């Protein structure tokens, strides 16, 4: 149901689009960090640190990351 | 007449335009186009030009500022004021069913009287006696409401001393006189100089030209000065005489400038041409100490007659002493990529020369545009000795007449009766402004004041109270020196009776045409 | 709402970009205008002239940076970054409805306030003007407002052509005599940065095509300026040719040559070996001069020939004839020369005759880099401009720290005169500290424990006693700056008097003038 | 989905995101406050002062202004009274952390230290400028209700208005003998009929069962009406358990439906009034007081719309809890009884707070003139990194009365400076005067607020402002 890639795209274009979701991240580590904020569309939203209530509604279109 | 209120309701936005840049405490609008032109004034004149207009009836009210731009040119926010004010009556009383000429005709009684009472509003100067006092204090409101009070404590001696030069004992003042002003880029817009002898503003343009003179003879031209076969020795000889017409005319300045003196060459001269200079003759001019120039203006050259006696010649063929003239003193400065010459010293010069120094183009427009129109405001004054004192105090006295008649001006009852409560209303909206513009309460100031004058009026005492809208409160035009020439103010209630009888007496708006 | 909406978010869109713009820490930044030349500079006013702007309020601080050129033009894009600073404070007044009458009064009660501080912050004032010792203390923080990668080259060659390139007297008063073009920009790719000296001779672009002889030695050139072209005399229309017998056919081309022979020939009998000529040179001249050896020049209009007015002293002639020593110059040699790898004319004097000019080599690998020193020797002009035209230029602590002390006096003055405008002059008293936070910003500083320290380290004026350190204490920008806060004379950093009084006193309008508009008219084209 | 805002761009859009909307509610502080409009999905419109329902209405395309609602709901739920002079302080703060932010690169937890250290001087102003009041004094009470319902015209029905909550106020109280006069107030139902007048509603100590007896001309007293928590069907089923009660000789009756006429012959052979069905949430209330025994009187009165019922206990103990009762507020028109119920309704948290912290809070924008003042005077002894945020706080107090002095339209920085001198130098009572605008003394003229009301008021608005801080990333669009 769709094409394929190969060559060093898939060393790079996987890889650099993990990098840019996990530099998103980074801005929670430590205690000096921030919170982030996760809306529900029904109007209210949760902000939460713990990584992994963040990447679980987090959008990723990349099956690497 | 259901298209009768059209163009009263479009035609009511356009008070808002002019209505910040009334009054010494307005503001300013900023008005750009797309060809470079930076134009920050409080001039209608400049406002109403290339700004696109909705409604067409803004075209008349251009039309009106014709005739105030000859009597007064500064000041013209009212006439707008007073027909915003009209539209809000407009559709107010117009409504309860009285017919809209009715109301004109009301403002036509309403004016006739406001004449008669204009006379004894007025103060009547004397301006033989030159005061100094009167002048500083006219002068002042009028740079208050164009520029900043910066260029208003500077600008103040300035406009003073310049109408003090055009005088006589039967009053005759030429306002084309004095006109040229500097413009010029040096410094900053507030280091502005007044200047009572003649500026000349071209210098030379080569290195050997004379840098400091005494006395100097101004040789004034107009015609171009710039000049434009069986065998090659044909070509030699006509391109060796293209110079011969120009050398001609060379050897008879070299003689006729030796005729009075040719000793000692210390005393300045000066060739004035308005096109192009043939750089052969710049050779002559180094040795023999001649200044000379390249695209020179003409009108500039008449200014010599009124001081020093100069005189203007077109051609080369009449040269005479009369049009060398005279100078005390010559101090020359060099500005950007043209000398600046000034002549001081003069005998007795009739004319001040306004030299006005600045940043850039839009500095200088709105020190320009103040001297101009702040100028042939005060020419005016000194033209008729009655004056009106200013600071809006007429407008609020001659409501109090207004408001109250009953017996004395009647005639028909509620016809007319509608147009003077509405004629007695619409000046009290300048007052409004002023105090709007100044950021304050108008209505509390204008409570105060109307409790100032039921004071004086029932204590049987003449005083004038004015507004004082620096610390928002009442005052006296008289103590304050907020004064108004007559033919200001008379022409200003004509010409807004005029201008509103053509809005009002509108029946229809029509579309005919073929699109 | 136009000051509300429009002239804050357009005007705050280039002041973020201004904030690099000013400093040693200076950045450089690509514009490409619409013609697709590339611009790259570290000047902010440099950027304002080829940038092409919309919004009218942005236009109008764009010809305040012009008028700062002519005056001072070192250092002055705090100009825009003042007032964005300006702005920012008065839009916290905007939102409140302050009356815009109170802030136009308290910039110039500060105004009046801020130059009468200035004339105590003078010390030191360098009389000599003509040495380098002396000059050194000038010339060299005045090499900080560019590019920092070498400090040491760009300070000796503006120190060096002070006796080359500025007219050199006993004891010059009375505005001595100074020119932007004093100092020729010759850009030419390849060499080391270090390659870049003063000489004291005339260096112009063009191959002689000819069978040019240079002479070295005996030296003793005569060289003449002439305005038309070198021929016979030329008809400006367009003639018609008349033949009727052979005489006329066959004798048609020998007029022609015959009579430039002898035209040129008086020239050659005067001994000379060059000329300065504005126009072009016709086909029949190159082909006599083959025989005597006489140089041509090749070089653009006037604009060119203004710097020539200066080297060789001589009045243009149109007519060619036997020019008289008035209209003849001096040049020592002239010889084709590789400099920069390139084979181009150079005048080398060893000890020459010139009039109140010289030239500078410029020797440099990018081009692009060689824009910003064009720059940087406009800024040499601008030094020697700032001492001769005023009394004198003083001295004033650099590096930003000037207005820091400026702070503490101001706000005493909002104290010291008790009013409404008490509040708004304090608003304006510390508006200042922008020009430490953009230097820091650039200066991989945190402002947040920097700045405090600076206030810290002044304090009022000293601790008891008689002398002033504050003078001599500024912003540090090195890798130490992390220790604390460095002195300035050790290294000599200094300002002038006239770059922060020509500033302020225009910034002082400029800041009221966007303010004083209450809505803007525009129109389409 | 992304909606992803990173560096400069995450904290600007969520400051402009509750910069707008505190514009917009400056026109609901004080009694001089303007009255908001609505826009539902449905056309309607909704005019009213209450900035619950203004901010639900209100659809912001900013999530993060959804918080302030619900940040708002929690003030409504612990204090929810006098909105009118509360409920703004919720948008004061996140519009003066405008200012610096990003200019001076600070980070945001550098921000959150300063912002928990603002909280820990903050609780020792709020009991500082406090003075206590007889709390047993129900006159006290009576000028306080009058206060926060200026905004209609109400005053002149004022006498009875205070006086029907006030007399449910010291009925319930006592939840404890001892350690603080905790109630509950939820149990008293305020019915609304249009019709009548004020006059018509009673209330007083006890137990009030809004219902009717057996016939409207029975005997209205009873000696001790002690209380105890077609045809053919209800005649026997019914019978079966109002006599059933009578075992322990009770002479009032309560049943879910009404009385037939076979139970007629033995209920009425008691020598009493027969009491009818109750209404259920009426059961309730007299659980909370009691078979209960020591009822003093009853009494049944007749009106067109509905009946009456009064049973007073009067004496609770033999210790005990606090009392339940009803109220029923009867309007002079449709129109008039719906709006004048928010002043009424809050009624029953007006003297709660008082019941909570008897000492008294200084009222009418002295109270954060107050807090600016001490916030301005910490900063500068505190100095180090706090220095700037810190006195930012101290502005976002003083901006507070800058919005009262908005609806009079003048210039706030004439009033704010005579502020800094008679008020911290002076007393504490010193204040702007709503009316005149102009500065009075709050006690003389009347305005005053229990100390209740600015503590879980700036306590919750300081702590709110934590999540603000807490902003990085955004992240919808996917689901939940």
Not at chain 3, 24 to 38: M, S
Not at chain 3, 406 to 422: A, C, D, M, N, V
Request: proline share 3%; charged share 25%.
């Amino acid at each position: 149901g769709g094409e394929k890639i190969s060559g060093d795209d898939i060393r790079n274009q996987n890889v650099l689009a993990t990098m840019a979701v996990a530099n998103v991240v980074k801005s929670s580590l430590g205690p000096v960090g921030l919170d982030k904020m996760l809306v529900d569309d029904i109007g209210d939203f949760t902000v939460t640190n713990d990584g992994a209530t963040i990447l679980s509604l987090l959008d990723v279109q990349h099956p690497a990351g | 007449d259901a298209a009768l209120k059209v163009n009263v309701t479009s035609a009511e936005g356009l008070q808002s335009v002019l209505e910040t840049n009334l009054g010494p405490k307005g503001t300013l609008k900023m008005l750009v186009d797309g060809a470079g032109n930076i134009k920050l004034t409080k001039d209608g004149k400049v406002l109403l030009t290339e700004m696109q207009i909705q409604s067409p009836t803004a075209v008349l009210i251009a039309r009106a500022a014709a005739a105030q731009d000859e009597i007064t040119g500064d000041g013209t926010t009212t006439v707008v004021c007073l027909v915003g004010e009209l539209l809000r009556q407009a559709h107010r009383f117009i409504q309860e069913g009285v017919h809209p000429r009715i109301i004109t005709d009301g403002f036509e009684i309403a004016r006739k009287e406001s004449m008669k009472f204009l006379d004894e509003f007025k103060i009547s100067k004397t301006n033989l006696s030159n005061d100094r006092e009167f002048l500083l204090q006219v002068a002042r409101s009028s740079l208050l409401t164009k520029v900043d009070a910066d260029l208003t404590e500077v600008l103040t001696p300035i406009v003073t001393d310049a109408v003090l030069s055009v005088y006589d004992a039967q009053a005759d003042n030429l306002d084309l006189h004095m006109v040229e002003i500097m413009q010029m880029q040096h410094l900053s817009p507030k280091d502005t100089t007044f200047i009572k002898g003649l500026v000349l503003d071209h210098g030379g343009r080569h290195p050997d030209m004379p840098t400091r003179v005494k006395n100097a003879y101004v040789l004034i031209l107009n015609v171009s000065l710039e000049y434009e076969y069986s065998s090659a020795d044909q070509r030699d000889k006509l391109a060796a005489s293209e110079r011969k017409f120009v050398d001609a005319k060379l050897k008879k300045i070299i003689d006729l400038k030796n005729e009075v003196c040719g000793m000692d060459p210390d005393k300045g001269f000066v060739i004035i041409n308005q096109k192009g200079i043939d750089p052969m003759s710049l050779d002559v001019f180094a040795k023999h100490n001649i200044l000379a120039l390249r695209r020179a203006k003409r009108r500039n050259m008449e200014r010599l007659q009124l001081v020093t006696g100069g005189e203007a010649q077109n051609s080369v063929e009449d040269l005479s002493p009369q049009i060398l003239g005279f100078s005390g003193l010559v101090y020359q400065e060099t500005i950007g990529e043209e000398k600046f010459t000034y002549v001081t010293e003069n005998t007795d010069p009739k004319s001040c020369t306004i030299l006005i120094k600045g940043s850039t183009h839009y500095a200088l427009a709105q020190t320009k545009d103040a001297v101009r129109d702040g100028l042939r405001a005060v020419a005016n004054v000194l033209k008729d000795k009655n004056i009106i004192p200013g600071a809006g105090a007429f407008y609020i006295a001659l409501s109090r007449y207004l408001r109250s008649a009953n017996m004395n001006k009647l005639g028909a009852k509620g016809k007319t009766k509608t147009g003077i409560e509405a004629f007695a209303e619409a000046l009290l909206v300048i007052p409004k402004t002023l105090v709007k513009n100044s950021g304050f309460d108008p209505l509390d100031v204008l409570a105060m004041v109307e409790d100032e004058l039921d004071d004086a009026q029932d204590s049987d005492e003449t005083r004038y109270v004015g507004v004082d809208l620096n610390i928002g409160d009442s005052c006296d035009p008289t103590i304050e020196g907020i004064w108004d020439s007559y033919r200001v103010l008379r022409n200003a209630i004509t010409g807004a009776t005029g201008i509103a009888s053509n809005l009002l007496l509108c029946d229809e708006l029509l579309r005919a045409g073929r699109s | 709402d136009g000051q509300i909406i429009k002239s804050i978010a357009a005007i705050r869109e280039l002041h973020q970009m201004c904030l690099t713009s000013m400093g040693p820490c200076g950045r450089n930044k690509i514009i490409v205008n619409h013609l697709g030349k590339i611009i790259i500079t570290n000047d902010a006013a440099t950027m304002l002239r080829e940038l092409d702007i919309v919004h009218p309020a942005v236009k109008v601080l764009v010809m305040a940076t012009e008028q700062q050129k002519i005056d001072m033009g070192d250092g002055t894009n705090l100009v825009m970054i003042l007032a964005g600073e300006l702005l920012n404070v008065s839009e916290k007044l905007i939102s409140m409805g302050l009356s815009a009458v109170e802030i136009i009064q308290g910039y110039n009660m500060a105004r009046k306030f801020t130059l009468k501080e200035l004339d105590e912050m003078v010390v030191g004032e360098i009389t000599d003007k003509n040495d380098k010792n002396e000059l050194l203390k000038m010339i060299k923080p005045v090499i900080s407002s560019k590019k920092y990668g070498s400090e040491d080259i760009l300070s000796e060659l503006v120190s060096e052509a002070v006796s080359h390139v500025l007219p050199v007297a006993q004891q010059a008063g009375e505005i001595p005599y100074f020119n932007v073009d004093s100092i020729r920009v010759v850009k030419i790719m390849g060499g080391s940065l270090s390659n870049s000296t003063v000489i004291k001779g005339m260096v112009f672009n063009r191959e002689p095509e000819g069978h040019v002889k240079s002479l070295s030695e005996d030296k003793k050139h005569k060289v003449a300026v002439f305005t038309c072209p070198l021929d016979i005399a030329n008809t400006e229309t367009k003639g018609t040719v008349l033949l009727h017998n052979a005489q006329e056919m066959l004798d048609f081309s020998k007029g022609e040559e015959k009579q430039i022979d002898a035209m040129m020939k008086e020239i050659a009998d005067m001994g000379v070996e060059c000329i300065v000529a504005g126009a072009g040179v016709g086909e029949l001249a190159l082909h006599y001069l083959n025989r005597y050896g006489i140089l041509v020049l090749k070089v653009p209009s006037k604009f060119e020939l203004r710097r020539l007015c200066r080297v060789c002293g001589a009045t243009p002639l149109p007519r060619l004839g036997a020019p008289t020593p008035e209209e003849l110059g001096l040049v020592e040699t002239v010889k084709t020369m590789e400099i920069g790898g390139d084979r181009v004319t150079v005048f080398k004097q060893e000890q020459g005759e010139i009039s109140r000019t010289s030239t500078i080599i410029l020797r440099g690998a990018t081009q692009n880099n060689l824009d910003d020193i064009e720059r940087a020797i406009d800024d040499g002009v601008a030094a020697v401009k700032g001492l001769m035209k005023p009394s004198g230029g003083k001295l004033l602590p650099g590096a930003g720290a000037t207005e820091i002390e400026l702070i503490s006096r101001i706000t005493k003055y909002g104290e010291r005169t008790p009013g409404l405008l008490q509040l708004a002059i304090k608003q304006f008293a510390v508006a200042f500290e922008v020009v430490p936070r953009t230097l820091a910003e650039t200066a991989g500083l945190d402002v947040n424990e920097v700045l405090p320290n600076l206030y810290a380290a002044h304090n009022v004026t000293e601790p008891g006693a008689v002398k002033t350190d504050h003078l001599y204490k500024g912003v540090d920008i090195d890798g130490e700056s992390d220790e604390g806060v460095k002195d300035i004379r050790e290294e000599n950093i200094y300002d002038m008097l006239a770059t922060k009084k020509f500033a302020i006193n225009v910034a002082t309008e400029a800041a009221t003038t966007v303010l004083s508009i209450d809505q803007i008219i525009m129109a389409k084209k | 989905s992304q909606e992803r805002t990173t560096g400069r761009q995450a904290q600007i859009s969520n400051i402009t995101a509750a910069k707008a909307v505190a514009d917009v509610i400056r026109t609901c502080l004080g009694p001089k406050a303007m009255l908001k409009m609505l826009l539902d999905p449905m056309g309607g419109l909704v005019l009213t002062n209450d900035g619950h329902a203004i901010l639900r209405e209100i659809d912001v395309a900013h999530p993060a202004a959804k918080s302030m609602l619900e940040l708002s709901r929690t003030q409504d739920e612990e204090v929810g009274d006098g909105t009118t002079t509360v409920i703004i302080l919720a948008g004061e703060i996140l519009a003066q952390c405008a200012p610096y932010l990003i200019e001076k690169n600070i980070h945001p937890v550098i921000i959150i230290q300063a912002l928990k250290k603002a909280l820990t001087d903050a609780l020792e102003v709020i009991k500082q400028v406090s003075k206590p009041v007889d709390v047993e004094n129900d006159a006290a009470m009576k000028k306080l209700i009058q206060a926060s319902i200026g905004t209609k015209y109400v005053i002149h029905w004022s006498e009875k208005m205070c006086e029907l909550a006030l007399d449910a106020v010291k009925t319930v109280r006592k939840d404890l003998g001892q350690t603080f006069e905790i109630d509950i107030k939820r149990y008293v139902r305020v019915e609304k009929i249009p019709g009548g007048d004020v006059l018509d509603s009673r209330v007083l100590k006890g137990v009030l069962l809004n219902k009717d007896v057996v016939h409207p001309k029975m005997s209205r007293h009873i000696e001790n009406p002690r209380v105890v928590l077609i045809l053919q069907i209800e005649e026997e089923q019914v019978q079966l358990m109002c006599e059933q009660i009578l075992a322990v000789r009770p002479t009032l009756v309560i049943t879910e439906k009404g009385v037939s006429d076979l139970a007629q012959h033995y209920l009425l052979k008691g020598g009493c009034s027969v009491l009818r069905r109750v209404k259920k949430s009426d059961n309730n209330r007299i659980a909370r007081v009691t078979v209960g025994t020591n009822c003093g009187l009853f009494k049944v009165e007749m009106i067109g719309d509905e009946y009456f019922s009064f049973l007073d206990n009067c004496k609770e103990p033999l210790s005990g809890l606090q009392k339940a009762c009803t109220i029923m507020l009867r309007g002079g028109s449709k129109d008039i009884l719906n709006e004048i119920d928010r002043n009424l309704q809050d009624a029953m948290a007006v003297a709660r707070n008082v019941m909570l912290s008897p000492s008294l809070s200084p009222g009418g924008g002295a109270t954060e003139m107050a807090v600016s003042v001490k916030l301005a005077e910490k900063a500068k002894q505190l100095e180090g990194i706090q220095q700037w945020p810190y006195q930012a706080v101290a502005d976002a107090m003083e901006c507070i009365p800058r919005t009262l002095i908005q609806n009079a339209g003048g210039d706030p920085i004439r009033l704010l400076s005579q502020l800094r001198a008679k008020h911290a130098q002076g007393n504490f009572t010193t204040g702007i005067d709503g009316d005149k605008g102009k500065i009075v003394d709050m006690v003389s003229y009347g305005i005053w607020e229990p100390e209740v009301i600015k503590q879980q008021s700036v306590k919750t608005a300081i702590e709110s402002a934590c999540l603000l801080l807490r902003v990085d990333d955004i992240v919808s669009g996917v689901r939940k």
